[PDB]
Amino acid sequence: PVEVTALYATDGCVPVYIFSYAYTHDGRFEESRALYQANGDSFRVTFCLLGRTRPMFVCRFDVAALQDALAHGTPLQPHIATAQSPWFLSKFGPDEKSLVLTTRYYLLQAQRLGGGGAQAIKDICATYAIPHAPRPDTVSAASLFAAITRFCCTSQYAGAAAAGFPLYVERRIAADVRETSALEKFITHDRSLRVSDREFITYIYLAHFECFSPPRLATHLRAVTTHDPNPAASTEQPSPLGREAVQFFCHVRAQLSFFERKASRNALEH
Amino acid sequence: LNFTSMHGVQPILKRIRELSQQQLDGAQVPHLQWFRDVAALESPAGLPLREFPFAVYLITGNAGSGKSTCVQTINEVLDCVVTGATRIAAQNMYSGAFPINTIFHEFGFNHVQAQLGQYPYTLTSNPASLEDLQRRDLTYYWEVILDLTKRALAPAFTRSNVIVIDEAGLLGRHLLTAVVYCWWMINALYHTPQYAARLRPVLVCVGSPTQTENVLTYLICNRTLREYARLSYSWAIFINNKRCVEHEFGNLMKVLEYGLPITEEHMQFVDRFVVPLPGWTRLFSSHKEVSAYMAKLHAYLKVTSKLAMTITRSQGLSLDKAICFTPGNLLNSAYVAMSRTTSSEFLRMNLNPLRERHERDDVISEHILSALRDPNVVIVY
Ligand SMILES: Cc1nc(N(C)C(=O)Cc2ccc(-c3ccccn3)cc2)sc1S(N)(=O)=O
Numbered sequence: 001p002v003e004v005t006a007l008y009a010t011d012g013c014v015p016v017y018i019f020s021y022a023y024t025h026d027g028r029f030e031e032s033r034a035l036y037q038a039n040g041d042s043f044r045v046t047f048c049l050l051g052r053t054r055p056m057f058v059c060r061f062d063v064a065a066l067q068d069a070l071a072h073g074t075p076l077q078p079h080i081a082t083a084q085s086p087w088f089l090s091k092f093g094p095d096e097k098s099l100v101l102t103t104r105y106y107l108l109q110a111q112r113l114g115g116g117g118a119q120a121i122k123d124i125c126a127t128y129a130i131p132h133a134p135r136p137d138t139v140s141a142a143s144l145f146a147a148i149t150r151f152c153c154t155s156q157y158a159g160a161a162a163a164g165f166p167l168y169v170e171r172r173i174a175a176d177v178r179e180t181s182a183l184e185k186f187i188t189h190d191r192s193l194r195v196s197d198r199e200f201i202t203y204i205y206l207a208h209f210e211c212f213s214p215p216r217l218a219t220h221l222r223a224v225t226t227h228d229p230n231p232a233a234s235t236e237q238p239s240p241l242g243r244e245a246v247q248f249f250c251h252v253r254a255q256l257s258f259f260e261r262k263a264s265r266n267a268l269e270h
Numbered sequence: 271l272n273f274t275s276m277h278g279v280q281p282i283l284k285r286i287r288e289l290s291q292q293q294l295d296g297a298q299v300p301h302l303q304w305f306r307d308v309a310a311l312e313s314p315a316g317l318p319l320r321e322f323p324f325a326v327y328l329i330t331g332n333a334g335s336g337k338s339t340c341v342q343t344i345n346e347v348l349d350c351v352v353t354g355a356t357r358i359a360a361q362n363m364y365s366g367a368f369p370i371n372t373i374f375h376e377f378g379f380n381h382v383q384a385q386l387g388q389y390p391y392t393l394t395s396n397p398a399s400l401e402d403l404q405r406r407d408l409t410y411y412w413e414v415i416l417d418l419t420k421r422a423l424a425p426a427f428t429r430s431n432v433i434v435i436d437e438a439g440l441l442g443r444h445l446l447t448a449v450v451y452c453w454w455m456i457n458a459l460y461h462t463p464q465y466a467a468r469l470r471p472v473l474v475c476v477g478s479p480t481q482t483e484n485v486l487t488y489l490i491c492n493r494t495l496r497e498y499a500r501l502s503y504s505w506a507i508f509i510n511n512k513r514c515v516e517h518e519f520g521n522l523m524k525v526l527e528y529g530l531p532i533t534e535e536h537m538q539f540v541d542r543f544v545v546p547l548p549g550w551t552r553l554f555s556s557h558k559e560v561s562a563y564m565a566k567l568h569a570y571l572k573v574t575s576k577l578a579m580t581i582t583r584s585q586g587l588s589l590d591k592a593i594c595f596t597p598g599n600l601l602n603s604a605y606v607a608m609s610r611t612t613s614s615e616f617l618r619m620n621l622n623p624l625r626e627r628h629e630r631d632d633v634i635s636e637h638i639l640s641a642l643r644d645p646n647v648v649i650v651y
Contacts, residue, residue: 052346052368091368118283119343120367121276180277188645197639198530204642205524208509208651212274267517 002040004070005055005108006047009145013083014049014056015075017145019152020104022070023111029231032163043067049083053107073153075146086145091120093140097132098125099151100158101165109166115177116169124172129225130161164229171236175224179241183211186249202259209266210248216241272512275336278650279343282329282506286348286474289325289504290432293468298323300454309419314389314409319401324450326489326499329476331508332527333586333609336650337476340508341434342367344474350432351376355440355477358586363436373435373445376426377418377452384414386444400498407447418452427453428462431469437586438475439482446485449473479634480527481606482585490637505641506648513612526605529635532624540624543617547591550618553581553607555595581607592618601630 004022008014022035022043043066046055059082068074092103102125110117133156142148152158187207195203223239248262300322308317329340345352346368353373354360364370372379391409393402408415427433433449435441450471457465479486489495496502514520518539525536552567554560560578567578581593581603589610595603604623611617641647 118347119276119279120346123271123273123276176277177280180274187649191643191645194643197528200639200643201524201528201530204509204649208274208649212651214271217271217273270517 001042001044002035004043004045005053005111006045006070007053007103007108008047008049009083009086009088011086011144015078016047016080017073017075017149018047018069019088019145019149020100020108020158029160029163029167029229033160036159036162038159050107051111069153071153073146073149073151075149086142086148088145089140089142089148092122094122096138096155097128097130097157098122099148100155101125101128101162103152104158104162105165105169112166114166114170115173116166124169125165127172127221127225128165128168129227130157130164130229131227161229164226164231167231168226168229168234171226171231171234172224175236175239176220179220179239182242183245186246187211190249190251199257199259202263206259206263206266207248210262211241211245216244219244272336272339274651275339275343278506278648279340281648282327282340283344283347285504286327286344286432286472289327289472290348290430290469292325292470294323294470295468299465299468300458302458305419305455305458306423308408308415309423314391314412317405317408319405321401322404322447322450322454323470324473324499325470326446326473326475326501326504328486328489328501328505329474329508330479330486330505332511332523333478333481334513334612335508335510336512337436337508338363340506340650341436341476344432344434348432349430350434350474351426351430352434352436354435355437356586358588359437359440363434371426373433373441373449376433377449377456378421381414381417384411386410386414388412398494400494403492403494404447404450407444408451410444411448415448415451419455422455422459425456425460425462427456427471428460428464431464432472432474435473435475435485436477437482438477438485439479440477440586441475441485443483443485443488446473446475446488478586479638480529480602481609487634490641491633501641502644502646505644506650507638507642508650509642510651516614519614523605523609526601527635528638529630529632532601537622537624540619540622543614543619544622545592545618546620547618549590550592550616551579551584551589551610552577553579553584553593553595553610555580555582555599555603557583559594559596584610591616592620593623594620595623597621597626600626600628603629 002022002024006018006021008016008018010016043061043063045059045061045066047057047059048055059080061082062079065076065079069076092099102122106120220239220241223237225235227235298321311317329337331337341352341363344350352363352370353376354363354370355373357372360370360372387410389409389412391406393406395402453471475485477486479490483491489499489501511520514523522536522539525532552563557580560580563578576587576589579587581595585606587610591611593604593607600623608617642649
């Protein structure tokens, strides 16, 4: 059945508002897509405040009113027979695609213990380029959680969009790590017959720009942007970062003064 | 956008965790008695030689190199007590992602006025084993560690064994061991779960080695401390600058920091800021010569403030927009002042501190170059 972890808040610093929130014990995208309708008999809930969230109580649950609370953001009446200022609008608060998904990942969904277990990057949700179908009435105008709870709970992003978020975080990090790790191995293995230190700084500071410059980092982000959440047709691509860096790492002729030549060029175009 | 950091803090958190989990053997733990014993002495001559075990991780780099975001990540992944050298660093590392006090406050600070160095001492074996070193460091704060030892025997260190200490350049070498001792002296007093667990205090000192002997020099430089903490496996350096966006000036601050030969081209460059503005910050090289604006700057409002400091007092300070150092008494001294303002459209100087005779120190730079050459030291851009 459904074990749901409800991250909740209250007007009087602790009604209850589940401002983000549900898993089933296994033994991956599609099952969650089948749970985020638009799907469980029993909703056993762990109500939590700020892993980075600590359970405060547990309720076994009328799945009707609970599903209402999870879906149209309604607050549970203390129907429950079973912290910081609404701050929460400054942090995690650029817009929807961040406010509803990164809050649910950071504080709630690193229980899957992915390599994303680790920061509040709010920097992978933006490479999460799922199509935005707009809606009116999304005027923040929120200062004393229902005003933000409704906002959160009825947005299209959190559906198949929500189910594909942890998977995309993992995929993001996987490709990023393979490229940065290959680059780091090439940087380290080239620090081992060594040059007069005058251009050793020229080597370090120029390699760390021939592989992580702003333009090539943008190219990588393009090669790792995702448009449809379904992992099947996800629009990612092989990243050029390693392949376009190995344009610079042809220091194998240095096995049978060049760094400042490339330094002078790069410096000119920059 | 900074991104390579999100992937360089990762290996750091691995080593910091490997160090925060390990448990010592049986005897290698300060027994509680070892503290009343220190409180039982009148001259730091009765101190028995013996290790207080510890491990440390170094996060070092230029000002504005991305050390702050590494602290931000470690604070929110590892359970740590985050602290700073001086209230500048405390108000710096203080909250934009998800309190913080000085490391002096953590072990407590009457304890201000200190006749440090009063009592004497000399080492023994030339490659002094840590036990020789701490024997000296505890002596240095006699009448400081002494009151601390007597009072506590008559608790933020007891929460976690990872202790973030930003801006380690402001703390002398005698604060590496003190923060060790007053950690062990507190965990062994209350018998916290850390003490039962045989955990060594993992200190993470973050600060600029060449831009401000301090803790960083005491670790980077001593051979026994390097062999004990394995700084080859415990060092990560932030090669970057997100506030210098000009090629020539960035090359000056790079020939200075890492200690490579000055060039007549660099001299020619520096002969462009010499100027013998009401905003340019007047840094100096004498605490009298800063009050000297009692005459010139003060009462200049009669006829018609971070503005006045010394270069060695502006280390770790934050400035927006003129070095007037006394000649003959100045290469690692200007580097402190020239790097305050972000760009060279606000720096001013009075003597060309690269053609004028000066005083250049190169031990820290030599170690930094050898460290970057080391295959096991993390480098982050
Ligand atoms: C073309 C190019 N651009 C490069 N960048 C992006 C930079 O230097 C950026 C920078 C600028 C200043 C520093 C610094 C270093 C020590 C002390 C203060 N500040 C570090 C980094 S490096 C090269 S090059 N000539 O090696 O190909």
